[PDB]
Write a protein that binds this ligand. Structure first.
Ligand SMILES: [Mg+2]
Ligand SMILES: [Mg+2]
Ligand SMILES: [Mg+2]
Ligand SMILES: [Mg+2]
Ligand SMILES: [Mg+2]
Ligand SMILES: [Mg+2]
Ligand SMILES: [Mg+2]
Ligand SMILES: [Mg+2]
Lengths: 384, 384, 384, 384
């Protein structure tokens, strides 16, 4: 299970670089130089890295220091072969963003968030990023009267339309991916799930420029089925990008390494991505626990890729098993793929076997044989 | 706080008629005649009632018994003035629906579910229903291999498109409202939240025929903010109908009476509905607890309407308070309503006060004054 | 992975016998004769079965029919070699128990619940049961004013003390195990977790007669760590019995087969039970999904035992691995087992290396190496 | 609703002093001088304040600076009349505590945590604290193999027994209160709920020295009923202290001001505390949201006390209402207070009206009238 750069594993600089500061604790690790992270991840078999603007260029850098950080970073990419498929904006750390960026109540803050983003898109294009991710981590509210959500949605649509106007203006070959999260650090966050983001995209001026970037642990913080959410995103044609990690149920955002958390969900996830032919990056947005030193940081990042590779092998064996293939026919997964009424509405209305002559009790008596199928999936996951 | 039929309070027959059977217990109350429920609700000040097909016509009724139940029901509506604004299909009780209706793996079951629905739409139109609700309570899965969600979404789209073809075919003035629920009785249910339903509607052939019917307790079973969800539905123009009840957090579907459960959320809900000018029915989908006898049934249903009326008074006082109106300006809710960049993209890029000359520290230092605003909302809710 | 009756797998009659009635659906399967369940489970490799009183003797049976059901049941046990290690009372199905049994507000109901229980203890002893389980499924409330919890706890203590007086009176060699559940079918249930039950036992007159019977899915309905709960029960000496199943997070009680649900938690559970030397029954309290016919019922029950056996093999390999044994020393699990201050309070106060001369920064810099250890546990679970 | 110091409202220095640093954001407010907080809280009507050791004496202070901070603090208490009823130890911020304090795997860290605590008890006694709170925020694990929970419980018992030996040794009139929390910042925390803490106390050498300090939002992070938990703590005699705040369901620890969050639960809480005659401090452990400036800080702290006072008035009116008093008799709350079988076991066994002659159907037919009672509680909460 050794990663190849064909496996397209990518990491956020903020992931292996997380210093371990949490709500009740100070940093446990020194800061990482972006250059060293690129080198270490390259040796581990990663394909690329991603960044917030403020991960790369310390907030408040003059043009001189900005260009110096960029050229050092770019040198590290040349020396390792690492790519930068995705970039994003930090619109949540600085106190100015305490009521949001695109949907702050203060108009001048909203303008500034648009400008800060625009400046990083230019940089993202220069480094070759294909996807620009937007996570509105501060767009929301702790109390009900603080945010008119219809107005806030007007301002959110407005920001994304202006960004699409810009990329169109500049001839940029780059697409946007909205990343949902239901809560934290705001008490409730706007566009809380994959569904809410998908719905919203359909109201934008140029919907084809916009997809979603779902995260395992985020949909799981609302107790939702992450493979189900991904399947609805693929069915709609909007899965531009994906963030992999683990999460143990409904609680604070854990950002465990991938495959930790809900293991059977990771299995069904990999199975879906592999079978659907998803070809984008396998991006890990995770936090090595603050118990770890740097050796634990790199072990945890290695574990992300290893667990994807093991599950991929297990899902491929599960779908290849002839006994599984017969189990699927036994549960009528083949019939689910067939049109309900390709013959049409009128034929349906005149088909007496569809109602008048339908033997409802015989139909109800057929078992679905789902428990045998699931044990085979278990047997395959465990290698039994 | 006495209900007027202008208040448009409506009840499901299955609500006050719930016999008290639960996963671990037998019925505590005898069955109610639909006629008696119409009479009792009319005396309480209700505007109308709603029904599943099987609430009204016992499953498996000949045409003779069917027409007899309908004419008795219709007589009760004539005698009381009660209306029937909404109707829906039972596609979840009978064992034949154990793997779903529109998305059962078995094709013959899917055909039968379409036919059973079509027969009830005709009836719904005859009784004057304006909205037809679809709750796919059995569309889902307990295990991962049992349902290909992309295929299932193909079958769901197919069913809803055929239904829209039918109403179009017949010149029916009726619209569909999809009711989301994240789980129970399936381990996970397809279209689990308002967002997932909104997204899906945009893929249908005739999206303008389809809206959502959100339920308080359903979005709250995923820990989501129900007023936030409703606001996104209004912003999209899709709030055709709404189901009111209470729920205490993430657990089984409680169906408590309205205003029980999360009280502050009910307040912010009423405030939104009243201020947005929502004009549809205020529908209660609730279950009088099985501890109650029939006198408790009617007290609980009365409590539904009373609590809506109290909160409506409190929200109206909150928005009318000049001190609240000044608090809202202090938190810049007025600025949230103003366009971020009505001047346009190019003006934004050349506006040096939006980035180069923006005093980020001064902006960050302004408090939002949200806690004063929320205490005024509290003071108003409590009548202090 | 074939079960031996030394593996002590036991099943509730109500488990494989569940007819599939749920809050929104009718039965999908016919009723099972207790005799046939004993035969079928014996062929599958089960060691024994358990029962509620009403599983075995239909509610309201004359003494004549009661003794006839008992003798038929007893004949089935003689013919198969099956044992009955545990029995319990149904104090939740009948409408009379709608406000609870031991803590009903009505005094006459509380008396009747005590008598119904006492009658089943006599029967349990005759059939050789060693543990009598109490699940107060209806002890609780949907609203706050309905139950004074201090009074209710007085009545609960009173019931359990009287039951202990009885078994003492009769010279019965049998112990009680309290089964916690946080909710459903009551909105909140009294003694909601393992901790609440453990605390309560310490207030009973004869605490040594009383332990806990935790259930996987129950502690998981509050989002708690089930292995952590079991370890606190073992540490206190109170793990008399245990109920195994699966559950996918915080939602209605799923009763999935064991190993479904949170798989990594099942692994850590088995590891704890095997290493601690737990010698009681491995009892499955589960529900074959109502999608299944009887062949699926027996496949699901087989899956319960298979998954226990696979995990047991994997946990045994994990603890036997020398590389794991060195990883555990690297994370200082050996030091956690050593007394903090066997030298005593005064030595601690005068030990300058414990405060005055303690190098806090050197200590903080040691990584815990937990992520390497967890990946080895993963590698072992998956058989990589 | 103006607070009197007889109302015994107390605040943690870390509460109004929280700078607004969260997992994804930097501080929004400057640090507060403990002296200014004492002055500002005194003007607001607070009775006292509480502290961690590191709130008062910056970590790593020489004896000279330590005594200087203490004397400045003590001067502020003399000038305002403020008391210090409770103190506690910071065993979670410093990186050395990243695997816990009392249950760190490293033995030298455990010794150091005991010594750091002991030093603050001496200080707590000098300032007149009556309760010493222990919150084991870092005692736990993110992965299963990292902590043997039985060993960890041995080390936890050991630490608390040594602390009790110390206070006994020194003749100190002070008692310990254990504060449970189910998660965050560890993935799971040991002693996760009130029940788990109560159970554990019963294993300590001197249980009478130890009670619990429950927090609203903590029990609510496991979806549990906080008034139910408090009632079990009062029934056991262990409610030494209490922490008040608000929390919106199962998610990260919000620390909203009291009365925000689950409002009806705050009502039932106040009702319980007032009726049970709880005489300890009403302590607010809350965080003014980081959206606020200092004026919002003080408004939020004022809101804590106001909302307690409003609810207290409403609960007192609810219990004083003759119509409520008759409703309680109608739901048989009076019978719940009466012994089930004061007549004894043998009388119970020979009482034919308790089983043989019991009319089970008549009993089951009595409604509980809980919904009328709850609407009166609602009517009273809202002032209708
Ligand atoms: Mg995250
Ligand atoms: Mg992310
Ligand atoms: Mg419902
Ligand atoms: Mg509904
Ligand atoms: Mg269960
Ligand atoms: Mg059980
Ligand atoms: Mg807290
Ligand atoms: Mg606290």
């Amino acid at each position: 299970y050794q990663p190849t750069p064909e496996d397209r594993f990518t990491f956020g600089l903020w992931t292996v670089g997380w210093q371990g500061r949490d709500p009740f604790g100070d940093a446990t690790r020194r800061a990482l130089d972006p250059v060293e992270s690129v080198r270490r991840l390259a040796e581990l078999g990663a394909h690329g890295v991603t960044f917030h603007d403020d991960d790369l260029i310390p907030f408040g850098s003059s043009d001189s220091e900005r260009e110096e950080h960029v050229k050092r970073f770019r040198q590290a990419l040349d020396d390792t072969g690492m790519k930068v498929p995705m970039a994003t904006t930090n619109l949540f750390t600085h106190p100015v963003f305490k009521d949001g960026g695109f949907t702050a109540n203060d108009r001048d803050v909203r303008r500034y968030a648009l400008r800060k983003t625009i400046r990083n898109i230019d940089l993202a294009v220069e480094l070759g990023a294909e996807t620009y991710v937007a996570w509105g981590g501060r767009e929301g509210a702790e109390s009900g009267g603080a945010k008119d959500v219809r107005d806030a949605l007007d301002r959110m649509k407005e920001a994304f339309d202006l960004l699409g106007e810009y990329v169109t203006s500049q001839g940029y070959d780059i697409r946007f991916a909205i990343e949902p999260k239901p809560n934290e650090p705001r008490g409730d966050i706007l566009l809380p799930t994959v569904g809410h983001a998908l719905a919203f995209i359909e109201r934008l001026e140029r919907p084809e420029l916009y997809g979603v970037n779902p995260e395992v642990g985020h949909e799981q913080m609302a107790g939702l089925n992450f493979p189900h959410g991904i399947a609805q995103a693929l069915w709609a044609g909007k899965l531009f990008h994906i963030d992999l990690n683990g999460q143990n149920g409904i609680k604070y955002d854990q950002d465990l390494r991938f495959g930790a958390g809900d293991l059977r969900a990771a299995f069904w996830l990999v199975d879906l991505l592999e079978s659907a032919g998803y070809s984008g990056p396998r991006h890990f947005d995770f936090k090595p626990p603050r118990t770890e030193d740097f050796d634990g940081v790199w072990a945890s990042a290695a574990g992300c890729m290893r667990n994807y590779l093991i599950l991929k092998e297990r899902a491929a064996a599960f779908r290849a098993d002839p006994e599984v293939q017969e189990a699927l026919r036994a549960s009528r997964l083949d019939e689910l793929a067939r049109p309900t009424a390709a013959d049409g509405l009128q034929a349906l209305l005149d088909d007496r076997s569809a109602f008048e002559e339908f033997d409802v009790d015989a139909a109800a008596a057929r078992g679905m044989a789902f428990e045998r199928l699931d044990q085979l999936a278990m047997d395959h996951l465990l290698g039994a």
